[PDB]
Amino acid sequence: MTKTLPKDFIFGGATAAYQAEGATHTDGKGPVAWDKYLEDNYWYTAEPASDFYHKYPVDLELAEEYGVNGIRISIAWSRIFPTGYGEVNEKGVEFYHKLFAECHKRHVEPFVTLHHFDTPEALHSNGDFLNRENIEHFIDYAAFCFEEFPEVNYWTTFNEIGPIGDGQYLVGKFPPGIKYDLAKVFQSHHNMMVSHARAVKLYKDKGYKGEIGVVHALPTKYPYDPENPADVRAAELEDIIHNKFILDATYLGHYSDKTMEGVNHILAENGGELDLRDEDFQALDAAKDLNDFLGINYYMSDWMQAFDGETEIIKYQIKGVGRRVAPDYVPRWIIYPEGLYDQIMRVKNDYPNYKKIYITENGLGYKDEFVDNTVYDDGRIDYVKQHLEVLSDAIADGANVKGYFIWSLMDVFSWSNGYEKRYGLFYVDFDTQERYPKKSAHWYKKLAETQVIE
Protein backbone atom coordinates (compact mmCIF):
# COMPACT_ATOMS: atom_id res chain seq x y z
CA MET A 1 0.00 0.00 0.00
CA THR A 2 3.12 2.21 -0.07
CA LYS A 3 3.38 4.31 -3.25
CA THR A 4 6.67 4.46 -5.17
CA LEU A 5 8.16 6.56 -7.98
CA PRO A 6 10.29 5.36 -10.91
CA LYS A 7 14.02 4.90 -10.34
CA ASP A 8 14.79 7.50 -13.04
CA PHE A 9 12.37 10.14 -11.70
CA ILE A 10 13.97 13.54 -11.22
CA PHE A 11 13.55 15.01 -7.77
CA GLY A 12 14.18 18.65 -8.47
CA GLY A 13 14.01 22.08 -6.96
CA ALA A 14 13.00 25.25 -8.77
CA THR A 15 14.32 28.83 -8.88
CA ALA A 16 13.72 31.85 -11.11
CA ALA A 17 16.17 34.62 -11.99
CA TYR A 18 14.74 37.88 -10.61
CA GLN A 19 13.43 36.08 -7.55
CA ALA A 20 16.69 34.39 -6.55
CA GLU A 21 19.65 36.22 -8.10
CA GLY A 22 19.79 39.72 -6.68
CA ALA A 23 22.47 41.85 -8.36
CA THR A 24 19.71 43.91 -9.98
CA HIS A 25 22.03 46.76 -10.89
CA THR A 26 25.38 44.97 -11.15
CA ASP A 27 27.49 43.56 -14.01
CA GLY A 28 25.71 45.35 -16.82
CA LYS A 29 22.29 43.96 -15.96
CA GLY A 30 19.49 45.77 -17.79
CA PRO A 31 16.26 46.81 -16.00
CA VAL A 32 12.92 45.04 -15.84
CA ALA A 33 9.44 46.42 -15.06
CA TRP A 34 9.62 45.17 -11.47
CA ASP A 35 12.42 47.59 -10.69
CA LYS A 36 10.37 50.76 -10.67
CA TYR A 37 7.19 48.95 -9.65
CA LEU A 38 8.50 47.40 -6.45
CA GLU A 39 10.50 50.48 -5.63
CA ASP A 40 7.82 53.13 -5.33
CA ASN A 41 5.12 50.67 -4.24
CA TYR A 42 6.63 48.57 -1.45
CA TRP A 43 9.09 48.51 1.46
CA TYR A 44 11.01 45.73 -0.27
CA THR A 45 12.77 45.06 -3.57
CA ALA A 46 14.55 42.19 -5.37
CA GLU A 47 17.84 43.19 -3.80
CA PRO A 48 19.34 41.07 -2.28
CA ALA A 49 16.61 38.45 -2.86
CA SER A 50 18.45 35.12 -2.27
CA ASP A 51 21.75 36.44 -3.66
CA PHE A 52 21.93 33.42 -6.01
CA TYR A 53 24.34 35.39 -8.17
CA HIS A 54 26.94 34.72 -5.50
CA LYS A 55 25.50 31.88 -3.44
CA TYR A 56 24.89 29.37 -6.23
CA PRO A 57 27.81 27.12 -5.24
CA VAL A 58 26.41 26.79 -1.69
CA ASP A 59 22.94 26.01 -3.08
CA LEU A 60 24.25 23.43 -5.55
CA GLU A 61 26.38 21.85 -2.85
CA LEU A 62 23.32 21.53 -0.62
CA ALA A 63 21.18 20.40 -3.55
CA GLU A 64 23.56 17.47 -4.23
CA GLU A 65 23.89 16.60 -0.53
CA TYR A 66 20.12 16.31 -0.15
CA GLY A 67 19.38 14.24 -3.24
CA VAL A 68 18.15 16.88 -5.66
CA ASN A 69 19.13 15.77 -9.17
CA GLY A 70 17.48 18.45 -11.30
CA ILE A 71 17.12 22.21 -10.96
CA ARG A 72 15.02 24.75 -12.82
CA ILE A 73 17.01 27.89 -13.57
CA SER A 74 16.04 30.82 -15.72
CA ILE A 75 18.37 33.06 -17.79
CA ALA A 76 17.56 36.73 -17.25
CA TRP A 77 17.00 38.22 -20.70
CA SER A 78 18.13 41.60 -19.33
CA ARG A 79 21.48 40.15 -18.22
CA ILE A 80 22.44 38.98 -21.73
CA PHE A 81 20.89 41.86 -23.76
CA PRO A 82 20.47 44.80 -21.36
CA THR A 83 18.23 46.62 -23.84
CA GLY A 84 16.41 43.54 -25.10
CA TYR A 85 18.47 43.14 -28.24
CA GLY A 86 21.69 44.29 -29.85
CA GLU A 87 24.70 44.56 -27.54
CA VAL A 88 25.59 41.33 -25.74
CA ASN A 89 26.65 41.74 -22.07
CA GLU A 90 29.59 39.36 -21.67
CA LYS A 91 29.52 39.33 -17.83
CA GLY A 92 25.94 38.11 -18.00
CA VAL A 93 26.92 35.36 -20.42
CA GLU A 94 29.92 34.39 -18.22
CA PHE A 95 27.71 34.10 -15.18
CA TYR A 96 25.44 31.48 -16.69
CA HIS A 97 28.36 29.47 -18.00
CA LYS A 98 29.68 29.39 -14.44
CA LEU A 99 26.27 28.49 -13.08
CA PHE A 100 25.75 25.64 -15.57
CA ALA A 101 29.28 24.41 -14.85
CA GLU A 102 28.50 24.16 -11.08
CA CYS A 103 25.28 22.22 -11.78
CA HIS A 104 27.00 19.62 -13.92
CA LYS A 105 29.81 19.47 -11.35
CA ARG A 106 27.22 18.78 -8.65
CA HIS A 107 25.29 16.30 -10.78
CA VAL A 108 22.20 18.54 -10.71
CA GLU A 109 20.85 18.59 -14.30
CA PRO A 110 19.87 22.15 -15.24
CA PHE A 111 16.45 22.65 -16.87
CA VAL A 112 16.68 26.17 -18.27
CA THR A 113 13.89 28.70 -18.97
CA LEU A 114 14.55 31.71 -21.23
CA HIS A 115 11.77 33.97 -19.96
CA HIS A 116 10.42 34.07 -16.41
CA PHE A 117 8.18 37.17 -16.07
CA ASP A 118 11.05 39.53 -16.87
CA THR A 119 10.94 41.10 -20.34
CA PRO A 120 13.63 43.86 -20.41
CA GLU A 121 11.93 47.12 -19.45
CA ALA A 122 12.86 48.78 -22.72
CA LEU A 123 10.73 46.22 -24.59
CA HIS A 124 8.13 45.76 -21.85
CA SER A 125 7.30 49.48 -21.79
CA ASN A 126 6.82 49.18 -25.56
CA GLY A 127 3.83 46.84 -25.37
CA ASP A 128 5.62 43.68 -24.21
CA PHE A 129 4.40 40.72 -26.31
CA LEU A 130 1.37 42.63 -27.55
CA ASN A 131 3.89 44.40 -29.80
CA ARG A 132 4.79 42.05 -32.66
CA GLU A 133 8.28 43.56 -32.97
CA ASN A 134 9.07 42.02 -29.58
CA ILE A 135 8.30 38.54 -30.93
CA GLU A 136 11.38 38.89 -33.15
CA HIS A 137 13.65 40.09 -30.39
CA PHE A 138 12.70 37.09 -28.26
CA ILE A 139 13.50 34.75 -31.12
CA ASP A 140 16.86 36.47 -31.57
CA TYR A 141 17.49 36.07 -27.86
CA ALA A 142 16.46 32.38 -27.84
CA ALA A 143 18.68 31.69 -30.86
CA PHE A 144 21.65 33.32 -29.16
CA CYS A 145 21.22 31.25 -26.01
CA PHE A 146 20.81 27.99 -27.95
CA GLU A 147 24.16 28.56 -29.60
CA GLU A 148 26.00 30.23 -26.76
CA PHE A 149 24.99 27.48 -24.31
CA PRO A 150 25.70 23.94 -25.56
CA GLU A 151 25.92 22.66 -21.96
CA VAL A 152 22.16 22.89 -21.59
CA ASN A 153 20.24 19.78 -22.61
CA TYR A 154 16.82 20.85 -21.41
CA TRP A 155 15.39 24.12 -22.60
CA THR A 156 12.08 25.84 -21.97
CA THR A 157 10.85 29.02 -23.67
CA PHE A 158 8.35 30.55 -21.22
CA ASN A 159 7.15 29.96 -17.72
CA GLU A 160 3.48 30.63 -17.06
CA ILE A 161 2.11 32.49 -20.11
CA GLY A 162 -1.41 32.29 -18.68
CA PRO A 163 -0.50 33.96 -15.35
CA ILE A 164 1.28 36.73 -17.27
CA GLY A 165 -1.74 37.67 -19.33
CA ASP A 166 -3.88 37.41 -16.20
CA GLY A 167 -1.62 39.58 -14.08
CA GLN A 168 -0.84 42.28 -16.64
CA TYR A 169 -4.24 42.59 -18.34
CA LEU A 170 -7.10 40.97 -16.37
CA VAL A 171 -6.45 41.52 -12.67
CA GLY A 172 -4.05 44.35 -13.42
CA LYS A 173 -1.82 43.51 -10.50
CA PHE A 174 1.44 43.38 -12.44
CA PRO A 175 2.60 46.21 -14.77
CA PRO A 176 1.18 47.69 -17.05
CA GLY A 177 -1.54 47.12 -14.47
CA ILE A 178 -4.39 47.05 -17.02
CA LYS A 179 -7.62 45.64 -15.67
CA TYR A 180 -10.40 43.56 -17.20
CA ASP A 181 -9.06 43.67 -20.78
CA LEU A 182 -9.91 40.20 -22.10
CA ALA A 183 -8.83 40.94 -25.67
CA LYS A 184 -5.33 41.75 -24.39
CA VAL A 185 -5.33 38.56 -22.29
CA PHE A 186 -6.02 36.43 -25.32
CA GLN A 187 -3.81 38.49 -27.65
CA SER A 188 -0.88 38.16 -25.23
CA HIS A 189 -1.55 34.41 -24.97
CA HIS A 190 -1.52 34.16 -28.75
CA ASN A 191 1.54 36.27 -29.53
CA MET A 192 3.55 34.46 -26.82
CA MET A 193 2.52 31.05 -28.16
CA VAL A 194 3.60 32.18 -31.62
CA SER A 195 6.99 33.17 -30.08
CA HIS A 196 7.20 29.75 -28.54
CA ALA A 197 6.39 27.89 -31.77
CA ARG A 198 8.95 29.88 -33.74
CA ALA A 199 11.70 29.31 -31.19
CA VAL A 200 10.92 25.62 -30.87
CA LYS A 201 11.01 25.21 -34.63
CA LEU A 202 14.21 27.25 -34.95
CA TYR A 203 15.87 25.00 -32.32
CA LYS A 204 14.95 21.82 -34.25
CA ASP A 205 15.84 23.34 -37.61
CA LYS A 206 19.31 24.31 -36.47
CA GLY A 207 19.68 20.70 -35.34
CA TYR A 208 20.45 21.13 -31.63
CA LYS A 209 20.67 17.86 -29.70
CA GLY A 210 18.78 18.68 -26.53
CA GLU A 211 15.13 18.77 -25.58
CA ILE A 212 12.85 21.80 -25.71
CA GLY A 213 9.37 22.32 -24.28
CA VAL A 214 7.10 24.84 -22.57
CA VAL A 215 5.95 25.32 -18.99
CA HIS A 216 2.26 26.10 -18.42
CA ALA A 217 0.47 26.97 -15.16
CA LEU A 218 -2.61 24.74 -15.34
CA PRO A 219 -5.05 25.19 -12.38
CA THR A 220 -7.90 22.74 -12.77
CA LYS A 221 -11.34 24.41 -13.12
CA TYR A 222 -14.36 22.68 -11.64
CA PRO A 223 -18.10 23.49 -11.61
CA TYR A 224 -19.21 24.51 -8.11
CA ASP A 225 -22.15 22.14 -8.56
CA PRO A 226 -21.29 19.33 -11.03
CA GLU A 227 -24.99 18.65 -11.56
CA ASN A 228 -25.64 22.22 -12.62
CA PRO A 229 -25.12 22.78 -16.39
CA ALA A 230 -24.72 26.54 -16.03
CA ASP A 231 -21.91 25.83 -13.55
CA VAL A 232 -20.32 23.34 -15.91
CA ARG A 233 -20.38 25.98 -18.64
CA ALA A 234 -18.88 28.66 -16.35
CA ALA A 235 -15.99 26.28 -15.51
CA GLU A 236 -15.55 25.50 -19.21
CA LEU A 237 -15.26 29.19 -20.12
CA GLU A 238 -12.92 29.81 -17.20
CA ASP A 239 -10.69 26.96 -18.41
CA ILE A 240 -10.66 28.50 -21.89
CA ILE A 241 -9.31 31.83 -20.59
CA HIS A 242 -6.57 30.24 -18.48
CA ASN A 243 -5.84 26.79 -19.90
CA LYS A 244 -7.52 25.58 -23.13
CA PHE A 245 -6.76 28.47 -25.51
CA ILE A 246 -3.04 28.09 -24.65
CA LEU A 247 -3.07 24.27 -24.80
CA ASP A 248 -4.74 24.28 -28.24
CA ALA A 249 -2.11 26.67 -29.64
CA THR A 250 0.52 24.38 -28.19
CA TYR A 251 -0.81 21.02 -29.34
CA LEU A 252 -3.32 21.48 -32.19
CA GLY A 253 -1.62 24.33 -34.05
CA HIS A 254 -4.93 26.20 -33.97
CA TYR A 255 -7.90 26.90 -31.72
CA SER A 256 -10.61 24.24 -31.58
CA ASP A 257 -14.23 25.12 -32.28
CA LYS A 258 -15.06 24.95 -28.56
CA THR A 259 -12.25 27.38 -27.78
CA MET A 260 -13.10 29.78 -30.60
CA GLU A 261 -16.78 29.63 -29.74
CA GLY A 262 -16.00 30.30 -26.07
CA VAL A 263 -13.54 33.09 -26.88
CA ASN A 264 -16.15 34.75 -29.16
CA HIS A 265 -18.74 34.60 -26.43
CA ILE A 266 -16.38 36.01 -23.77
CA LEU A 267 -15.32 38.93 -26.00
CA ALA A 268 -18.88 39.54 -27.20
CA GLU A 269 -19.77 40.09 -23.54
CA ASN A 270 -16.65 41.99 -22.62
CA GLY A 271 -15.51 43.69 -25.83
CA GLY A 272 -12.50 43.52 -28.09
CA GLU A 273 -11.31 41.43 -31.05
CA LEU A 274 -8.23 39.37 -31.75
CA ASP A 275 -5.58 40.08 -34.37
CA LEU A 276 -5.09 36.59 -35.84
CA ARG A 277 -2.79 36.25 -38.85
CA ASP A 278 -2.19 33.40 -41.33
CA GLU A 279 1.52 33.28 -40.53
CA ASP A 280 0.60 32.91 -36.86
CA PHE A 281 -1.19 29.64 -37.59
CA GLN A 282 1.52 28.65 -40.04
CA ALA A 283 3.95 28.92 -37.10
CA LEU A 284 1.84 27.12 -34.49
CA ASP A 285 1.11 24.32 -36.96
CA ALA A 286 4.80 23.70 -37.70
CA ALA A 287 5.53 23.35 -34.01
CA LYS A 288 2.55 21.42 -32.68
CA ASP A 289 4.51 18.12 -32.74
CA LEU A 290 8.00 19.41 -31.90
CA ASN A 291 7.65 19.76 -28.12
CA ASP A 292 9.67 17.15 -26.25
CA PHE A 293 7.97 17.66 -22.90
CA LEU A 294 5.33 19.69 -21.13
CA GLY A 295 5.95 21.47 -17.86
CA ILE A 296 2.96 21.68 -15.53
CA ASN A 297 2.96 24.16 -12.64
CA TYR A 298 0.18 23.42 -10.20
CA TYR A 299 -0.71 24.66 -6.71
CA MET A 300 -4.50 24.50 -6.41
CA SER A 301 -7.79 24.22 -8.29
CA ASP A 302 -10.67 26.60 -8.82
CA TRP A 303 -14.42 26.15 -8.58
CA MET A 304 -16.79 28.15 -10.83
CA GLN A 305 -20.38 29.20 -10.34
CA ALA A 306 -22.61 30.53 -13.11
CA PHE A 307 -23.73 33.95 -11.95
CA ASP A 308 -24.06 36.89 -14.32
CA GLY A 309 -22.92 40.35 -13.29
CA GLU A 310 -20.33 43.02 -13.97
CA THR A 311 -16.66 42.05 -14.18
CA GLU A 312 -14.97 42.44 -10.80
CA ILE A 313 -11.74 41.04 -9.47
CA ILE A 314 -10.31 42.19 -6.14
CA LYS A 315 -13.45 38.30 -5.25
CA TYR A 316 -13.28 37.12 -8.88
CA GLN A 317 -16.13 37.24 -11.35
CA ILE A 318 -16.23 37.77 -15.09
CA LYS A 319 -19.16 39.02 -17.13
CA GLY A 320 -20.47 36.16 -19.28
CA VAL A 321 -18.35 33.59 -17.46
CA GLY A 322 -19.16 33.49 -13.77
CA ARG A 323 -17.69 33.65 -10.29
CA ARG A 324 -15.03 31.82 -8.31
CA VAL A 325 -16.56 30.22 -5.27
CA ALA A 326 -14.91 27.68 -2.93
CA PRO A 327 -16.71 24.42 -2.05
CA ASP A 328 -18.09 24.39 1.49
CA TYR A 329 -16.44 21.16 2.64
CA VAL A 330 -13.12 20.95 0.82
CA PRO A 331 -9.96 21.00 2.97
CA ARG A 332 -8.24 24.33 3.64
CA TRP A 333 -5.42 28.22 -0.27
CA ILE A 334 -7.58 25.10 -0.64
CA ILE A 335 -5.68 21.81 -0.85
CA TYR A 336 -6.94 19.61 -3.66
CA PRO A 337 -4.37 17.08 -5.04
CA GLU A 338 -6.94 15.37 -7.23
CA GLY A 339 -6.86 18.55 -9.28
CA LEU A 340 -3.39 17.60 -10.49
CA TYR A 341 -4.41 14.03 -11.30
CA ASP A 342 -7.33 15.42 -13.35
CA GLN A 343 -5.23 18.00 -15.16
CA ILE A 344 -2.62 15.37 -16.11
CA MET A 345 -5.23 13.00 -17.49
CA ARG A 346 -6.92 15.89 -19.34
CA VAL A 347 -3.69 16.69 -21.17
CA LYS A 348 -3.13 13.00 -21.86
CA ASN A 349 -6.61 12.60 -23.32
CA ASP A 350 -7.01 15.87 -25.19
CA TYR A 351 -3.47 16.15 -26.56
CA PRO A 352 -2.12 12.56 -26.92
CA ASN A 353 0.98 14.00 -28.60
CA TYR A 354 2.09 15.52 -25.24
CA LYS A 355 4.85 12.85 -25.04
CA LYS A 356 6.24 13.50 -21.59
CA ILE A 357 5.24 15.48 -18.51
CA TYR A 358 7.25 17.17 -15.74
CA ILE A 359 5.55 18.79 -12.75
CA THR A 360 7.72 21.91 -12.95
CA GLU A 361 6.28 23.71 -9.90
CA ASN A 362 4.31 22.62 -6.83
CA GLY A 363 4.81 23.75 -3.27
CA LEU A 364 3.35 25.31 -0.13
CA GLY A 365 4.34 28.77 0.95
CA TYR A 366 3.66 30.31 4.35
CA LYS A 367 5.46 32.15 7.17
CA ASP A 368 7.98 29.58 8.39
CA GLU A 369 8.79 29.46 12.07
CA PHE A 370 12.60 29.35 12.39
CA VAL A 371 13.57 27.38 15.50
CA ASP A 372 16.60 25.28 16.41
CA ASN A 373 18.23 26.63 13.24
CA THR A 374 15.68 24.84 11.10
CA VAL A 375 11.95 24.77 10.40
CA TYR A 376 9.66 21.95 11.46
CA ASP A 377 7.58 22.39 8.30
CA ASP A 378 5.30 19.37 8.62
CA GLY A 379 2.61 21.20 6.70
CA ARG A 380 4.79 21.54 3.59
CA ILE A 381 5.88 17.92 3.86
CA ASP A 382 2.26 16.75 3.90
CA TYR A 383 1.21 18.97 1.01
CA VAL A 384 4.07 17.76 -1.19
CA LYS A 385 3.60 14.14 -0.13
CA GLN A 386 -0.08 14.25 -1.08
CA HIS A 387 0.80 15.64 -4.48
CA LEU A 388 3.56 13.12 -5.09
CA GLU A 389 1.00 10.40 -4.33
CA VAL A 390 -1.36 11.42 -7.11
CA LEU A 391 1.67 11.47 -9.45
CA SER A 392 2.38 7.86 -8.58
CA ASP A 393 -1.27 7.02 -9.38
CA ALA A 394 -1.22 9.01 -12.61
CA ILE A 395 1.88 7.14 -13.75
CA ALA A 396 0.33 3.79 -12.80
CA ASP A 397 -2.73 4.81 -14.83
CA GLY A 398 -0.73 5.47 -17.94
CA ALA A 399 0.59 9.04 -17.83
CA ASN A 400 4.22 9.63 -18.71
CA VAL A 401 5.37 11.78 -15.79
CA LYS A 402 9.17 11.85 -15.37
CA GLY A 403 9.86 14.41 -12.72
CA TYR A 404 8.74 16.80 -10.04
CA PHE A 405 10.28 20.15 -9.23
CA ILE A 406 9.41 21.68 -5.88
CA TRP A 407 8.96 25.45 -5.79
CA SER A 408 11.35 26.45 -4.41
CA LEU A 409 14.84 25.03 -3.70
CA MET A 410 15.75 27.68 -1.16
CA ASP A 411 13.56 30.54 0.10
CA VAL A 412 13.26 33.15 -2.65
CA PHE A 413 11.68 36.61 -3.05
CA SER A 414 7.95 36.90 -3.83
CA TRP A 415 6.68 39.97 -5.72
CA SER A 416 3.35 39.92 -3.94
CA ASN A 417 4.57 39.06 -0.44
CA GLY A 418 8.20 40.09 -0.42
CA TYR A 419 10.27 37.95 1.89
CA GLU A 420 7.37 36.91 4.16
CA LYS A 421 5.85 34.03 2.19
CA ARG A 422 8.41 31.17 2.13
CA TYR A 423 8.41 27.98 0.01
CA GLY A 424 11.93 26.62 0.20
CA LEU A 425 13.38 23.31 1.29
CA PHE A 426 16.20 25.46 2.61
CA TYR A 427 15.54 28.45 4.87
CA VAL A 428 17.49 31.57 3.90
CA ASP A 429 18.32 34.10 6.62
CA PHE A 430 17.99 37.03 4.25
CA ASP A 431 20.31 39.34 6.25
CA THR A 432 23.26 36.99 6.24
CA GLN A 433 22.28 34.85 3.22
CA GLU A 434 23.00 31.74 5.29
CA ARG A 435 21.07 28.59 4.30
CA TYR A 436 19.55 26.10 6.72
CA PRO A 437 17.90 22.87 5.64
CA LYS A 438 14.34 22.60 6.87
CA LYS A 439 12.69 19.37 7.99
CA SER A 440 11.33 18.93 4.46
CA ALA A 441 14.84 18.94 2.98
CA HIS A 442 15.69 15.89 5.07
CA TRP A 443 12.45 14.25 4.07
CA TYR A 444 13.03 15.08 0.42
CA LYS A 445 16.46 13.42 0.73
CA LYS A 446 15.05 10.13 1.96
CA LEU A 447 12.46 10.28 -0.83
CA ALA A 448 15.01 10.85 -3.62
CA GLU A 449 17.29 7.97 -2.55
CA THR A 450 14.44 5.57 -1.84
CA GLN A 451 11.68 6.75 -4.21
CA VAL A 452 9.13 5.59 -1.66
CA ILE A 453 6.52 8.15 -0.69
CA GLU A 454 6.35 7.78 3.09
UniProtKB/Swiss-Prot annotation:
Q: Which residues form the active site?
A: E160 (proton donor), E361 (nucleophile)
Q: What class of enzyme is it?
A: hydrolase
Pathway recorded for this protein: Carbohydrate metabolism; lactose degradation; D-galactose 6-phosphate and beta-D-glucose from lactose 6-phosphate: step 1/1
GO BP = lactose catabolic process via tagatose-6-phosphate
The reply to whether Glycoprotein figures as a keyword in the UniProt entry is no
Name a GO molecular-function annotation: beta-glucosidase activity
What reaction does this enzyme carry out catalytically?
a 6-phospho-beta-D-galactoside + H2O = D-galactose 6-phosphate + an alcohol
Q: Does the keyword S-adenosyl-L-methionine apply?
A: no
Signal peptide residues are none
Q: Which GO terms describe its cellular component?
A: cytosol
What's the short name of a Pfam family annotated to this entry? Glyco_hydro_1
List the induction conditions: By lactose. The operon consists of lacABCDFEGX.
Q: Which residues bind D-galactose 6-phosphate?
A: Q19, H116, N159, E160, N297, S414, W415, K421, Y423
Q: Which family does it belong to?
A: Belongs to the glycosyl hydrolase 1 family.
Q: What does the further note read? A: This gene was sequenced from pMG820, a laboratory-derived deletion of the naturally occurring plasmid pLP712.
HAMAP family, alphabetized: LacG
Q: What is this protein called?
A: 6-phospho-beta-galactosidase
In which organism is this protein found? Lactococcus lactis subsp. lactis
Taxon lineage? Bacteria, Bacillati, Bacillota, Bacilli, Lactobacillales
Gene encoding the protein: lacG
